[PDB]
Amino acid sequence: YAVAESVIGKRVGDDGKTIEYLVKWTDMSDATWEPQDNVDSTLVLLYQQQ
Amino acid sequence: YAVAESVIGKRVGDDGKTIEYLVKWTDMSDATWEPQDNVDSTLVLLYQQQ
Amino acid sequence: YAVAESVIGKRVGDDGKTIEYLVKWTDMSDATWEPQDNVDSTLVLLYQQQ
Amino acid sequence: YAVAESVIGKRVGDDGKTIEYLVKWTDMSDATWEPQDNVDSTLVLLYQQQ
Amino acid sequence: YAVAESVIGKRVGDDGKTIEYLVKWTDMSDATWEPQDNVDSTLVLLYQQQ
Amino acid sequence: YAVAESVIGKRVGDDGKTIEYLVKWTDMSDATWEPQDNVDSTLVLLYQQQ
Amino acid sequence: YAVAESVIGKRVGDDGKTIEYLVKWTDMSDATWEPQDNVDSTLVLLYQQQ
Amino acid sequence: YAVAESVIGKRVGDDGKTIEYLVKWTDMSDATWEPQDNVDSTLVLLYQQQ
Ligand SMILES: [Mg+2]
Ligand SMILES: [Mg+2]
Ligand SMILES: [Mg+2]
Ligand SMILES: [Mg+2]
């Protein structure tokens, strides 16, 4: 699964009709799942605001 | 195709005359084209302002 | 060793109980240890505030 | 050649005396040298302020 | 979802009992899903052998 | 533009019919276009065989 | 901690005496520690030969 | 400074005459200079053959 950063492009697809946007994704490299105790409350509290 | 982030360098080329700048590019890794429905209006509306 | 950037996810672990957060890490690629003289005072003074 | 982003660490070296800082570097991947005409004046004018 | 390349490490976990291996993963950056027609039969036939 | 390395996955698309393969791409980071003189004949001769 | 792939360079250090080699490291991005059950015996058996 | 892996492309430059090849470079990320003692003789002996 992944989360989108921003949009950096716009084009027309192969069908010649549909509009496609170029989506920048957060790298899932340099990303791990860790138990709630290993993380600092701060970063979590910032995630909750998002 | 690619989009430029910023300039982080300045030098003289091999001809000994022309000025070259060092351009940082957005990685086209972690980037996909997706149909207009898969994207959130927000990120698009931010792209339109750019 | 590594340093955490932010939290970009939340899930339940394999035990079906514990809460896990998805932690983005700074890449340790593009990172070297250098003696105190090679670094500019500025970047250090910014690190001290962190 | 390379340019430093920030400092994200501090340690003591192998000699047991000297202080070392952990320097994050801009990736020189996703970076090319391009002639002054290919670049937008804007990004250059931002580089000049740096 | 992800696919494992190889094992490059071995350690003992935080419980002090369980054995953990360090798994190298294929980057899911530089990876896209594409319809069967866009791909060459060859690469597919190589995948089928895997 | 890009060049395919291998196939590392297989799935069914959103339409519920079409077969999609997961294509690993060569990173276009760490890649530059250079004049024929800057390159060694060898690497070129290897490209010609491909 | 890290593991070395190969050597791709050779130079003289800042002291003007010592010989330094340029070491390519496996990225610790795209690498996680996982319990012995999550890994396939094969990859482990290949690690043991190393 | 950098070292070339292979050639993965061929095109005509902007002048409309010169032939350009697309060169894949080893990432200088995940690469450090280390004293001759920190490296294993093996990897060095493999570098000498190159
Ligand atoms: Mg990645
Ligand atoms: Mg890339
Ligand atoms: Mg890395
Ligand atoms: Mg790099």
Numbering used by the authors:
A (entry chain A), B (entry chain A), C (entry chain A), D (entry chain A), E (entry chain A), F (entry chain A), ...: 319 to 368
Extract from the study:
Co-translational targeting of chloroplast-encoded cargo proteins is carried out by cpSRP54 alone, whereas the post-translational cpSRP transport pathway is mediated by cpSRP54 in complex with cpSRP43, a 43-kDa protein that is unique to chloroplasts. CpSRP43 is a modular protein with a unique arrangement of three chromodomains (CD1–3) and four ankyrin repeats (Ank1–4)2425. Chromodomains and ankyrin repeats are versatile protein–protein interaction modules and allow cpSRP43 to participate in numerous, specific interactions with linear motifs. Here we present a detailed structural and biochemical analysis of the cpSRP43 CD2CD3 interaction with A3CT, demonstrating that CD3 binds to a linear motif of A3CT and that LHCP targeting is regulated by a serial connection of ankyrin repeats and chromodomains.
To characterize changes in the conformation and dynamics of CD3 on ligand binding, we also determined the structure of the unliganded CD3 domain by X-ray crystallography and NMR. Both structures are in the open conformation characterized by the unstructured first strand β2a due to the absence of its binding partner. In the crystal structure, the CD3 fold is stabilized by helix swapping between crystallographic neighbours emphasizing the high flexibility of isolated chromodomains. Helix swapping is probably due to crystal packing forces as the NMR structure exhibits a compact monomeric chromodomain fold in solution.
